[PDB]
Amino acid sequence: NLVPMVATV
Amino acid sequence: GVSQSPSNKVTEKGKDVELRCDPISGHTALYWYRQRLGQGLEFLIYFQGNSAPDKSGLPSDRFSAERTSVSTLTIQRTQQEDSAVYLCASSQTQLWETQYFGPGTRLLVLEDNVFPPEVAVFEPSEAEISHTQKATLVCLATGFYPDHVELSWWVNGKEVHSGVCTDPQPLKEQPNDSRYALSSRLRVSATFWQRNHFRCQVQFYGLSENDEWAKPVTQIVSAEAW
Amino acid sequence: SHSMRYFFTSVSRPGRGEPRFIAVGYVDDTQFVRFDSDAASQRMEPRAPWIEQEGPEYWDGETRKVKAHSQTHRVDLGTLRGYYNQSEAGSHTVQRMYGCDVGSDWRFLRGYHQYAYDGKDYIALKEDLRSWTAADMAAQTTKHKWEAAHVAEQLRAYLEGTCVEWLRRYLENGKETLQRTDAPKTHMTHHAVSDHEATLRCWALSFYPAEITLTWQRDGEDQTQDTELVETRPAGDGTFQKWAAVVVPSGQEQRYTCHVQHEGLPKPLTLRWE
Amino acid sequence: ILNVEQSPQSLHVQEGDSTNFTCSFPSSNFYALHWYRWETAKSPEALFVMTLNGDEKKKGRISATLNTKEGYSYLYIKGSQPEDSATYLCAFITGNQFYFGTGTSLTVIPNIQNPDPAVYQLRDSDKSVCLFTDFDSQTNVSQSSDVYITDKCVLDDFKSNSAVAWSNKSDFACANAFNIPEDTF
Amino acid sequence: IQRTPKIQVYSRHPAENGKSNFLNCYVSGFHPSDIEVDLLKNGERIEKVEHSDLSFSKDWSFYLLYYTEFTPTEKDEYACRVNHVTLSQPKIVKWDRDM
């Protein structure tokens, strides 16, 4: 299970 | 705040449109929404930086976005269903982050009748103004098409939002090509009505950069009460 | 102790289209998933036998997010290439690694999330799980972005939360491959360079996990330095190897030893010749 | 695709009560959640944005709760007011795309003191308008191809509910304003 | 940034001639990932070769593998040729059957 969604820079 | 022009727009089958949205300073993310009532809302495209990582949400090819801070949205070949309110919002940077929404841009398909409104200001009762004691002021705008008519209340040139009232839904005269009608009221104290000018001015969005062609163009028309 | 971890890499590809993005997922020392921007599948293919039995909803679920990643990476490259005032045809890399590890009690012990651009460090999540480290000034704002987007939080709740919650799910299911300990296969060979000298060679094959320490003694002394040690390397079955060797004046061979210590062995194995 | 639901579209409270909506959404692969308010035509506003289980943020008299493993997010309104009357939206964000549950819309019922139902006139500038004032407020106007009205709208120290009505041919508009009211004109 | 590749050729298990085995060519600790690799049979590039999905170490330096089925007898010499930035020319290191 990946993290559902990440950030960006 | 946010800016999103044109406030409204009416044009026909088989032409282009440019939809502006200007996010607030420093916003970096933008969302494009359209809403078909009564379908519900669903999402079209999100922009970050200067890049469109996802496309496969806006339905077809005529739709295509450009980011120019500010950006535009283009659909060549305006056709039948592409007939909704198009909304634009911005959160700094980040998707989950709090979105702030633009004014809104209506758009209606068609080819063709279209015309500006009536504006007729009624005046209230002999005895009612002494009944309350109460004062009251009415307005009424009909015989127009299509919806993209927003009301402006003016008095001494400076607007008023205190007591005013506009109706939310327009009135189809019938029932599917028939045209519209609206009615805004007001209440003002009564000593107040003894030699001022209470403006019911009404904005109709026609076409004032001429398109194909009783005119009828962006106009303000206004009926006045004493 | 045990851990489940995702490595991310997206390589910019100028004038020839979408940046290649490779996502690969590891639990402990083995590889259980993969995604590739140039994959036939365009979806998350299982790499380890035990995870294939996972639901049809799972692979759809996972695929959906790993896409979201490569989207965001396709974003990151761009929104970095303008921070650093750099060209369009530079073909840069971005790296993200994240994941959680657990004790023998089997619960949260460590959380990692780290991020580097075009090689050297960029930004890393402090183990505080509440603060950040900025390698650059460019980073220090990305810090300030996340510092306000409350980014520390979501990740934390993921790592303390569903990262672990699923890590056990994986282990219990992949009890077979993950929880094992296959003690290394020990071997030794002699290969001469002359009559003047000779080269003793210490082999450790077919071991899991990969973290192994194998040392090499002369009469009891650790001949630290005339010895050569090579990055523990992989093989099939997903098992590992390592190789160490020295110069040995001819005849003085039986003086030299070899100690192979590993989690699969109760006490170090002394390898001789012979 | 994964489903989202809110419940229900339609709540009508007496301006004294309190209110709660029920945005469902999945358990799995949660990340964020959003609550939106949509008055008529104007800016839809971000109200709360929910991040983690289990949080409880409130602003003024609006409040909301998140629960993740159990797929739901409640939103409470306190001391309902006219001002509140809108349509409320929960959003579900996972994997860089949005999922809005079918809207849920709130209308309150403005309570007024001292109701005097006088049906005033019509207008001149010589044409006709026929209506009502006060009249609160579950006295609900609802009509008939050329007999025209509107329902309704509310004002400002006091509030007034008033429904304008006009026509042209023959029938006029006051004894014709009958479509409800009593004890009024 | 620039980091030299560390090449390392080797057989999956030790070699009993003419029996079912595999050959690996594990590269390591390099940057940026712009790598050219080829597995040889006396100078023979053929591509029924697989490859490990690309990963790295928090030294920030990618590492891959290039396995392939193989069967040697007494003198079928193999090698590995790898091309990368920071290399004057692709460096060929062959396969000593005991390294």
PDB file of C-alpha atoms in Angstrom, chain C residues 62-241:
ATOM      1  CA  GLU C  62      -2.154   0.645  -5.813  1.00  0.00           C
ATOM      2  CA  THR C  63      -1.918   1.407  -9.521  1.00  0.00           C
ATOM      3  CA  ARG C  64      -4.111   4.425  -9.023  1.00  0.00           C
ATOM      4  CA  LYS C  65      -1.726   5.971  -6.527  1.00  0.00           C
ATOM      5  CA  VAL C  66       1.568   5.142  -8.213  1.00  0.00           C
ATOM      6  CA  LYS C  67       0.170   7.022 -11.212  1.00  0.00           C
ATOM      7  CA  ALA C  68      -0.552   9.980  -8.957  1.00  0.00           C
ATOM      8  CA  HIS C  69       3.105   9.831  -7.988  1.00  0.00           C
ATOM      9  CA  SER C  70       4.525   9.928 -11.507  1.00  0.00           C
ATOM     10  CA  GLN C  71       2.109  12.765 -12.164  1.00  0.00           C
ATOM     11  CA  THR C  72       3.540  14.660  -9.234  1.00  0.00           C
ATOM     12  CA  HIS C  73       7.076  13.790 -10.298  1.00  0.00           C
ATOM     13  CA  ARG C  74       6.354  14.996 -13.811  1.00  0.00           C
ATOM     14  CA  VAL C  75       5.362  18.104 -11.847  1.00  0.00           C
ATOM     15  CA  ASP C  76       8.385  18.184  -9.528  1.00  0.00           C
ATOM     16  CA  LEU C  77      11.047  18.106 -12.270  1.00  0.00           C
ATOM     17  CA  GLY C  78       9.369  21.042 -13.962  1.00  0.00           C
ATOM     18  CA  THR C  79       8.776  23.027 -10.803  1.00  0.00           C
ATOM     19  CA  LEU C  80      12.435  22.476  -9.875  1.00  0.00           C
ATOM     20  CA  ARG C  81      13.946  23.303 -13.258  1.00  0.00           C
ATOM     21  CA  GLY C  82      12.614  26.841 -12.769  1.00  0.00           C
ATOM     22  CA  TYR C  83      13.801  27.216  -9.185  1.00  0.00           C
ATOM     23  CA  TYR C  84      17.328  26.416 -10.262  1.00  0.00           C
ATOM     24  CA  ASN C  85      17.218  28.541 -13.421  1.00  0.00           C
ATOM     25  CA  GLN C  86      18.022  25.635 -15.753  1.00  0.00           C
ATOM     26  CA  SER C  87      17.339  24.677 -19.402  1.00  0.00           C
ATOM     27  CA  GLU C  88      14.579  22.460 -20.854  1.00  0.00           C
ATOM     28  CA  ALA C  89      16.872  19.847 -22.325  1.00  0.00           C
ATOM     29  CA  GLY C  90      18.810  18.864 -19.220  1.00  0.00           C
ATOM     30  CA  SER C  91      17.304  15.454 -18.410  1.00  0.00           C
ATOM     31  CA  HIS C  92      17.431  15.575 -14.607  1.00  0.00           C
ATOM     32  CA  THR C  93      16.491  13.047 -11.944  1.00  0.00           C
ATOM     33  CA  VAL C  94      14.288  13.199  -8.910  1.00  0.00           C
ATOM     34  CA  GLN C  95      14.419  10.643  -6.197  1.00  0.00           C
ATOM     35  CA  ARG C  96      11.853   9.929  -3.432  1.00  0.00           C
ATOM     36  CA  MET C  97      12.187   7.097  -0.851  1.00  0.00           C
ATOM     37  CA  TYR C  98       9.571   6.637   1.961  1.00  0.00           C
ATOM     38  CA  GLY C  99       8.445   3.861   4.336  1.00  0.00           C
ATOM     39  CA  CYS C 100       8.171   2.503   7.876  1.00  0.00           C
ATOM     40  CA  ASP C 101       9.975  -0.064  10.020  1.00  0.00           C
ATOM     41  CA  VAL C 102       9.073  -2.093  13.069  1.00  0.00           C
ATOM     42  CA  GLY C 103      10.506  -3.708  16.146  1.00  0.00           C
ATOM     43  CA  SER C 104      10.495  -7.341  17.256  1.00  0.00           C
ATOM     44  CA  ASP C 105       7.356  -6.448  19.172  1.00  0.00           C
ATOM     45  CA  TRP C 106       6.164  -5.638  15.646  1.00  0.00           C
ATOM     46  CA  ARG C 107       5.036  -2.043  15.930  1.00  0.00           C
ATOM     47  CA  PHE C 108       6.128   1.426  14.824  1.00  0.00           C
ATOM     48  CA  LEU C 109       9.788   2.202  15.427  1.00  0.00           C
ATOM     49  CA  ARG C 110      10.998   4.358  12.538  1.00  0.00           C
ATOM     50  CA  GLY C 111       9.514   6.510   9.790  1.00  0.00           C
ATOM     51  CA  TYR C 112      11.460   7.688   6.763  1.00  0.00           C
ATOM     52  CA  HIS C 113      10.563  10.031   3.960  1.00  0.00           C
ATOM     53  CA  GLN C 114      13.435  11.460   1.908  1.00  0.00           C
ATOM     54  CA  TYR C 115      13.829  13.392  -1.322  1.00  0.00           C
ATOM     55  CA  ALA C 116      16.802  14.375  -3.488  1.00  0.00           C
ATOM     56  CA  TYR C 117      17.114  16.133  -6.839  1.00  0.00           C
ATOM     57  CA  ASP C 118      19.596  15.408  -9.570  1.00  0.00           C
ATOM     58  CA  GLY C 119      21.722  13.367  -7.213  1.00  0.00           C
ATOM     59  CA  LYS C 120      22.670  14.972  -3.921  1.00  0.00           C
ATOM     60  CA  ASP C 121      20.200  15.647  -1.105  1.00  0.00           C
ATOM     61  CA  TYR C 122      17.297  18.055  -1.357  1.00  0.00           C
ATOM     62  CA  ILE C 123      14.857  17.610   1.534  1.00  0.00           C
ATOM     63  CA  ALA C 124      14.326  14.924   4.130  1.00  0.00           C
ATOM     64  CA  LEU C 125      11.686  14.332   6.776  1.00  0.00           C
ATOM     65  CA  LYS C 126      13.189  14.555  10.217  1.00  0.00           C
ATOM     66  CA  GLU C 127      12.485  11.494  12.339  1.00  0.00           C
ATOM     67  CA  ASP C 128      10.543  13.871  14.505  1.00  0.00           C
ATOM     68  CA  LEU C 129       7.817  13.237  11.906  1.00  0.00           C
ATOM     69  CA  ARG C 130       6.986  16.884  12.624  1.00  0.00           C
ATOM     70  CA  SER C 131       9.829  18.818  11.018  1.00  0.00           C
ATOM     71  CA  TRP C 132      12.033  18.957   7.917  1.00  0.00           C
ATOM     72  CA  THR C 133      15.629  19.378   6.782  1.00  0.00           C
ATOM     73  CA  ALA C 134      16.488  21.645   3.858  1.00  0.00           C
ATOM     74  CA  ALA C 135      19.726  20.957   2.009  1.00  0.00           C
ATOM     75  CA  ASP C 136      19.284  24.049  -0.170  1.00  0.00           C
ATOM     76  CA  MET C 137      17.508  27.373   0.050  1.00  0.00           C
ATOM     77  CA  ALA C 138      15.277  26.098  -2.735  1.00  0.00           C
ATOM     78  CA  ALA C 139      14.453  23.278  -0.349  1.00  0.00           C
ATOM     79  CA  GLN C 140      13.940  25.608   2.635  1.00  0.00           C
ATOM     80  CA  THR C 141      10.903  27.042   0.882  1.00  0.00           C
ATOM     81  CA  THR C 142       9.639  23.592  -0.165  1.00  0.00           C
ATOM     82  CA  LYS C 143       9.986  23.061   3.555  1.00  0.00           C
ATOM     83  CA  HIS C 144       7.935  26.200   4.145  1.00  0.00           C
ATOM     84  CA  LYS C 145       5.417  24.963   1.602  1.00  0.00           C
ATOM     85  CA  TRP C 146       4.981  21.665   3.405  1.00  0.00           C
ATOM     86  CA  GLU C 147       5.413  23.398   6.779  1.00  0.00           C
ATOM     87  CA  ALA C 148       2.116  25.131   5.983  1.00  0.00           C
ATOM     88  CA  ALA C 149       0.384  22.460   3.911  1.00  0.00           C
ATOM     89  CA  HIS C 150       0.742  20.543   7.164  1.00  0.00           C
ATOM     90  CA  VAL C 151       2.482  17.820   5.137  1.00  0.00           C
ATOM     91  CA  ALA C 152       4.359  16.310   8.085  1.00  0.00           C
ATOM     92  CA  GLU C 153       0.985  15.207   9.497  1.00  0.00           C
ATOM     93  CA  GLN C 154      -0.529  13.160   6.651  1.00  0.00           C
ATOM     94  CA  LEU C 155       2.672  11.189   6.117  1.00  0.00           C
ATOM     95  CA  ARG C 156       3.073  10.631   9.847  1.00  0.00           C
ATOM     96  CA  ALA C 157      -0.457   9.260  10.181  1.00  0.00           C
ATOM     97  CA  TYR C 158       0.303   7.069   7.176  1.00  0.00           C
ATOM     98  CA  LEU C 159       3.553   5.699   8.530  1.00  0.00           C
ATOM     99  CA  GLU C 160       2.387   5.241  12.116  1.00  0.00           C
ATOM    100  CA  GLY C 161      -0.926   4.131  10.613  1.00  0.00           C
ATOM    101  CA  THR C 162      -1.513   2.234   7.390  1.00  0.00           C
ATOM    102  CA  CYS C 163       2.114   1.702   6.398  1.00  0.00           C
ATOM    103  CA  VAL C 164       2.585  -0.521   9.425  1.00  0.00           C
ATOM    104  CA  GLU C 165      -0.985  -1.821   9.304  1.00  0.00           C
ATOM    105  CA  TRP C 166      -0.183  -3.181   5.868  1.00  0.00           C
ATOM    106  CA  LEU C 167       3.397  -4.202   6.606  1.00  0.00           C
ATOM    107  CA  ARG C 168       2.147  -6.897   8.959  1.00  0.00           C
ATOM    108  CA  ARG C 169      -0.476  -7.822   6.360  1.00  0.00           C
ATOM    109  CA  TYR C 170       2.368  -8.447   3.955  1.00  0.00           C
ATOM    110  CA  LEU C 171       4.580 -10.363   6.382  1.00  0.00           C
ATOM    111  CA  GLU C 172       1.853 -12.673   7.688  1.00  0.00           C
ATOM    112  CA  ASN C 173       0.930 -13.420   4.056  1.00  0.00           C
ATOM    113  CA  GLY C 174       4.503 -13.682   2.819  1.00  0.00           C
ATOM    114  CA  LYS C 175       5.482 -15.686   5.890  1.00  0.00           C
ATOM    115  CA  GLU C 176       7.348 -18.050   3.578  1.00  0.00           C
ATOM    116  CA  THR C 177       9.823 -15.657   1.826  1.00  0.00           C
ATOM    117  CA  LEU C 178      10.086 -12.726   4.122  1.00  0.00           C
ATOM    118  CA  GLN C 179      10.236 -14.217   7.582  1.00  0.00           C
ATOM    119  CA  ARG C 180      12.821 -16.845   6.672  1.00  0.00           C
ATOM    120  CA  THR C 181      16.507 -16.899   7.400  1.00  0.00           C
ATOM    121  CA  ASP C 182      18.563 -18.871   4.932  1.00  0.00           C
ATOM    122  CA  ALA C 183      22.061 -19.168   6.358  1.00  0.00           C
ATOM    123  CA  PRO C 184      24.791 -18.448   3.751  1.00  0.00           C
ATOM    124  CA  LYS C 185      26.547 -21.145   1.731  1.00  0.00           C
ATOM    125  CA  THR C 186      30.222 -21.003   2.642  1.00  0.00           C
ATOM    126  CA  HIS C 187      33.039 -21.742   0.226  1.00  0.00           C
ATOM    127  CA  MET C 188      36.735 -21.072  -0.189  1.00  0.00           C
ATOM    128  CA  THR C 189      39.102 -21.228  -3.138  1.00  0.00           C
ATOM    129  CA  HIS C 190      42.845 -20.884  -3.650  1.00  0.00           C
ATOM    130  CA  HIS C 191      44.161 -19.201  -6.757  1.00  0.00           C
ATOM    131  CA  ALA C 192      47.859 -18.623  -7.254  1.00  0.00           C
ATOM    132  CA  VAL C 193      49.485 -15.517  -8.720  1.00  0.00           C
ATOM    133  CA  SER C 194      53.009 -16.946  -8.430  1.00  0.00           C
ATOM    134  CA  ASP C 195      55.095 -19.305  -6.318  1.00  0.00           C
ATOM    135  CA  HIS C 196      56.163 -16.178  -4.441  1.00  0.00           C
ATOM    136  CA  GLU C 197      52.553 -15.289  -3.545  1.00  0.00           C
ATOM    137  CA  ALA C 198      49.006 -16.702  -3.613  1.00  0.00           C
ATOM    138  CA  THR C 199      45.393 -15.513  -3.334  1.00  0.00           C
ATOM    139  CA  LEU C 200      43.005 -17.064  -0.837  1.00  0.00           C
ATOM    140  CA  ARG C 201      39.342 -16.416  -1.621  1.00  0.00           C
ATOM    141  CA  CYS C 202      36.331 -16.436   0.723  1.00  0.00           C
ATOM    142  CA  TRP C 203      32.889 -17.213  -0.724  1.00  0.00           C
ATOM    143  CA  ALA C 204      29.482 -16.784   0.857  1.00  0.00           C
ATOM    144  CA  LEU C 205      26.600 -17.641  -1.437  1.00  0.00           C
ATOM    145  CA  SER C 206      22.828 -17.937  -1.400  1.00  0.00           C
ATOM    146  CA  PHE C 207      21.996 -15.956   1.737  1.00  0.00           C
ATOM    147  CA  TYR C 208      19.013 -13.927   2.897  1.00  0.00           C
ATOM    148  CA  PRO C 209      18.896 -11.253   4.077  1.00  0.00           C
ATOM    149  CA  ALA C 210      21.777  -9.410   2.426  1.00  0.00           C
ATOM    150  CA  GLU C 211      23.259  -7.714   5.469  1.00  0.00           C
ATOM    151  CA  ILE C 212      26.232  -9.986   6.114  1.00  0.00           C
ATOM    152  CA  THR C 213      29.586  -9.428   7.794  1.00  0.00           C
ATOM    153  CA  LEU C 214      32.358 -11.743   6.660  1.00  0.00           C
ATOM    154  CA  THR C 215      35.867 -11.096   7.944  1.00  0.00           C
ATOM    155  CA  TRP C 216      39.303 -12.554   7.415  1.00  0.00           C
ATOM    156  CA  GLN C 217      42.025 -13.300   9.996  1.00  0.00           C
ATOM    157  CA  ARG C 218      45.779 -13.927   9.924  1.00  0.00           C
ATOM    158  CA  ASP C 219      46.713 -15.893  13.074  1.00  0.00           C
ATOM    159  CA  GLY C 220      43.877 -14.047  14.826  1.00  0.00           C
ATOM    160  CA  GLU C 221      44.655 -10.586  13.458  1.00  0.00           C
ATOM    161  CA  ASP C 222      42.131  -8.926  11.145  1.00  0.00           C
ATOM    162  CA  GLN C 223      44.056  -8.401   7.925  1.00  0.00           C
ATOM    163  CA  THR C 224      41.950  -5.424   7.355  1.00  0.00           C
ATOM    164  CA  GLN C 225      43.780  -4.025   4.621  1.00  0.00           C
ATOM    165  CA  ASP C 226      45.385  -6.324   2.211  1.00  0.00           C
ATOM    166  CA  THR C 227      41.944  -7.831   1.994  1.00  0.00           C
ATOM    167  CA  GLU C 228      39.355  -6.904  -0.697  1.00  0.00           C
ATOM    168  CA  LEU C 229      35.571  -6.711   0.124  1.00  0.00           C
ATOM    169  CA  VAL C 230      32.911  -6.243  -2.651  1.00  0.00           C
ATOM    170  CA  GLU C 231      29.327  -4.802  -2.370  1.00  0.00           C
ATOM    171  CA  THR C 232      27.038  -7.589  -1.277  1.00  0.00           C
ATOM    172  CA  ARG C 233      25.373  -8.476  -4.570  1.00  0.00           C
ATOM    173  CA  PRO C 234      22.097 -10.177  -5.607  1.00  0.00           C
ATOM    174  CA  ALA C 235      21.128 -13.368  -7.396  1.00  0.00           C
ATOM    175  CA  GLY C 236      18.141 -15.517  -8.382  1.00  0.00           C
ATOM    176  CA  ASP C 237      15.564 -16.576  -5.789  1.00  0.00           C
ATOM    177  CA  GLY C 238      16.351 -13.060  -4.603  1.00  0.00           C
ATOM    178  CA  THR C 239      19.311 -14.317  -2.618  1.00  0.00           C
ATOM    179  CA  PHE C 240      22.679 -12.699  -2.041  1.00  0.00           C
ATOM    180  CA  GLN C 241      26.423 -13.165  -2.303  1.00  0.00           C
TER     181      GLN C 241
END
